[PDB]
């Protein structure tokens, strides 16, 4: 299990430990550089927009209120821009853990990792830890309750005898993903059963083809199409007689998920996580 963020109050600051290291973070930080899009959404949802001084502007359609913040990268980190903003806090997730030592020379750097084996507990701890910095625990607990209620509404309507498959299409490559993966919340949080519970743990997933999809005969197929960031599109990759024969194709349950949520992994967002939960619920209702 990923080590959680723990914080102890030391008056003007918190002593913060997370899986990457320890930091003294000032209370109410006022110049925050955020490289994780999900946590940027949570800043919005907690009304902390004025605390943010840098984002990866090179930005999905749901985060356009930050389009005029100074750019610190693309998700490609620009260290010069970061230093020149003189931040009092840098927030990162998985995709930037490789940059940790360099960012930490600039300013205290908080890791809000999403644990693919314990998604909801990581999500809660990330949101509540950011809130504690600002004394917003009450407000963050109300919104965390809203998301839990949405998960319960979504779970309530899932069919126990149907099975789904998750795939990522990248140009013409198809790769399968299962429980406890980067897309795992379809199986792990919303309880939708998988066609294969034993695809191997790892970020690149398992290479598959249409024969595989036919062999599994999924009731639903969830597609994360990284071609939508061209020409070739999952719909054409799956435009064939193998995929056509599948229960998913026959009942028009090939679901194309918005990659600006799923591929960019905005699970740390109070509002973005909600939109993802609703997107699943509305596909299988």
Numbering used by the authors: 22 to 79, 81 to 97, 99 to 252, 255 to 310
What is written in the article reporting this PDB entry?
The periplasmic binding protein (PBP) CeuE1 is an important component of the Fe(III) uptake system in Campylobacter jejuni, a commensal Gram-negative bacterium in the avian gut, but a common source of food poisoning in humans. CeuE, an integral part of the CeuBCDE ABC transporter of C. jejuni, is responsible for capturing Fe(III)-siderophore complexes in the periplasm for delivery to their respective inner membrane transporter. C. jejuni does not itself synthesize siderophores, but capitalizes on their secretion by other bacteria, such as E. coli. Here we report a combined solution and structural study of a series of synthetic tetradentate analogues of the enterobactin-derived bis(2, 3-dihydroxybenzoyl-L-Ser), to explore the ligand-binding promiscuity of CeuE, both wild type and with mutations of the Fe(III) binding residues H227 and Y288.
To probe the relative contributions of His227 and Tyr288 to Fe(III)-siderophore binding, site-directed mutagenesis was then used to replace the side chains of the two Fe(III)-coordinating amino acids with non-coordinating side chains of similar size. In addition, the double mutants H227L/Y288F and H227A/Y288F were created. All five mutants (Y288F, H227L, H227A, H227L/Y288F, H227A/Y288F) were crystallized in their apo form, and all structures are closely similar to that of wild type CeuE. However while there is clear electron density for the Y288F mutation in its three structures, H227L and H227A are located in a flexible loop region and there is generally no electron density to confirm their presence. Mutation of the Fe(III)-coordinating tyrosine led to a drastic drop in binding affinity in both the single (Y228F) and the double mutants (H227L/Y288F and H227A/Y288F), with Kd values above 1 μM. Site-directed mutagenesis of CeuE revealed that Y288 is essential for binding, as the binding affinity observed in the fluorescence titration experiments is far weaker for all mutants containing Y228F when compared to the wild type protein. This finding is confirmed by the lack of CD signal corresponding to the Λ-configuration when Fe-5-Lic is added to these mutants.
